[PDB]
Amino acid sequence: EGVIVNGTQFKDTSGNVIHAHGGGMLKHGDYYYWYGEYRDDSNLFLGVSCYRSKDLVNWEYRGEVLSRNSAPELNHCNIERPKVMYNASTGEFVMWMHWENGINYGQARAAVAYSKTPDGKFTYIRSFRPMQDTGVMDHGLPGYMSRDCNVFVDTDGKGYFISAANENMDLHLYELTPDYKNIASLKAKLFVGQQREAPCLIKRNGYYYLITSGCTGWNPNQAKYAYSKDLASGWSQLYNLGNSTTYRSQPTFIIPVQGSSGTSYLYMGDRWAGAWGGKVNDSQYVWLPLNFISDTTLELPYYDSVKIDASSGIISEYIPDTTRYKLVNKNSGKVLDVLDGSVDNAAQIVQWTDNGSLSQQWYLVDVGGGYKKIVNVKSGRALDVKDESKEDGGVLIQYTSNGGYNQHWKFTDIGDGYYKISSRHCGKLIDVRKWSTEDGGIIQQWSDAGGTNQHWKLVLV
Numbered sequence: 001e002g003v004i005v006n007g008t009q010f011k012d013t014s015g016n017v018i019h020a021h022g023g024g025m026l027k028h029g030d031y032y033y034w035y036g037e038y039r040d041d042s043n044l045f046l047g048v049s050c051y052r053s054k055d056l057v058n059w060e061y062r063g064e065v066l067s068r069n070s071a072p073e074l075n076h077c078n079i080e081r082p083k084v085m086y087n088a089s090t091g092e093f094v095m096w097m098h099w100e101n102g103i104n105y106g107q108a109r110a111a112v113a114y115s116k117t118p119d120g121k122f123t124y125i126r127s128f129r130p131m132q133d134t135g136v137m138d139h140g141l142p143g144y145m146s147r148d149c150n151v152f153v154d155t156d157g158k159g160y161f162i163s164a165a166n167e168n169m170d171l172h173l174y175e176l177t178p179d180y181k182n183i184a185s186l187k188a189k190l191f192v193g194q195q196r197e198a199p200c201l202i203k204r205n206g207y208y209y210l211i212t213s214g215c216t217g218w219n220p221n222q223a224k225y226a227y228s229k230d231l232a233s234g235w236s237q238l239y240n241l242g243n244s245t246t247y248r249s250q251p252t253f254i255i256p257v258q259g260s261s262g263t264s265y266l267y268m269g270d271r272w273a274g275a276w277g278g279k280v281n282d283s284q285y286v287w288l289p290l291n292f293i294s295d296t297t298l299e300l301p302y303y304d305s306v307k308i309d310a311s312s313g314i315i316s317e318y319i320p321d322t323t324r325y326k327l328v329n330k331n332s333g334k335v336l337d338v339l340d341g342s343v344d345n346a347a348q349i350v351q352w353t354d355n356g357s358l359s360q361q362w363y364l365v366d367v368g369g370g371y372k373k374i375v376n377v378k379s380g381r382a383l384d385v386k387d388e389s390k391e392d393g394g395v396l397i398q399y400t401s402n403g404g405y406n407q408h409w410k411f412t413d414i415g416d417g418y419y420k421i422s423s424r425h426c427g428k429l430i431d432v433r434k435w436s437t438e439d440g441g442i443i444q445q446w447s448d449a450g451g452t453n454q455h456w457k458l459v460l461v
């Protein structure tokens, strides 16, 4: 039962709430290590917890790899978004983070630590504003400002540290020295004046991807991403990821989960309790699979429950009720299907002859109220009203799950095993365009006209 429930606080094997907010993860040896920070009673840096696991669902407490006792300046300060990276050369784990006074946010500086072991007590080094010796001034103080940060290890073995500089208006990508413990140079300035936060740097197939968020404090916002063949330059524009609130969370880290079947990229986020006036320690977590439609097209769907099999390297949606269904039209006798049985995103939904194919099989996931999710079997995509249309003739397609109301459907029994499937967005029924009775008939959205082309029978398979 390797299933995770988003919007909650995961519990470790001990039965206690996991506290690794704004944390990250590292895959070394046979274990996945989850680092993170958490405040105390005075909302100050208490410690950087570390959790270990092989299945990525059951986490074991390993203590604080970093504490407020590890250093004199760690006593009364703010530490958030701590990330850990491994060095093949040295053989030691280097840890980066964001440091503040605890009184204010004027000291936008980065902090560094390291240890010979992953779950061992780290030794704090120093806190500083990158390029301090260069003499450069960034808003009153020497050295580039450094708040929200993250680490990345390239294929060539070069370490990288990224953080928000120039009052969180610009992103600075710093190249680290071979030891990962110092900054070697300023690789490039990314997305200037665009004010992107909570950056996550990853790589797939010679393509670098940068998942960022907006700057609106606790309030969740529209997450975005970009790609490039080179870190120095060639970066694309910003493309929206997830919904308008990133499913009520903020991106924190993204790691490749490799297994026998292949590689599935895992997304980590934080549902900050600050949104509803709660303390940082009451923040929940949101884990979702990061899917790659193409080298240039990314997808971040929202599953209320996610199943993970680290061994095989598969991250997909968890369906509570695996019961398969066929939706047969009363008028045509055809069943609900996907055009050309495609698994592509935004694929047109059409009616087709009952041929017992996968494309014609659908799950039904309850999502509160009298509404449900109609999910295709051949493709985990959900039945969706294109562009959240509220007009007659509005085409229906299969799209990535995004918790949108244009993906919620209510079944209204009309008798004899037939239903009127209305959308939650406007209330219009699933309709076969122009009363079509042939294969390829466009499935659309239309007002309840009492027509038989709007009536569907639910059949178990």
Ligand SMILES: OC[C@H]1O[C@@H](O[C@H]2[C@H](O)[C@@H](O)[C@H](O)O[C@@H]2CO)[C@H](O)[C@@H](O)[C@H]1O
Residues within 6 Å of the ligand: 346, 384, 385, 386, 387, 388, 399, 402, 404, 406, 407
């Ligand atoms: O493309 C399908 C997709 O559309 C979303 O609606 C978007 C729409 O894509 C976009 O063109 C428009 O500018 O904004 C709409 C929402 O704000 C749906 O949300 C999604 O479920 C899919 O249907």
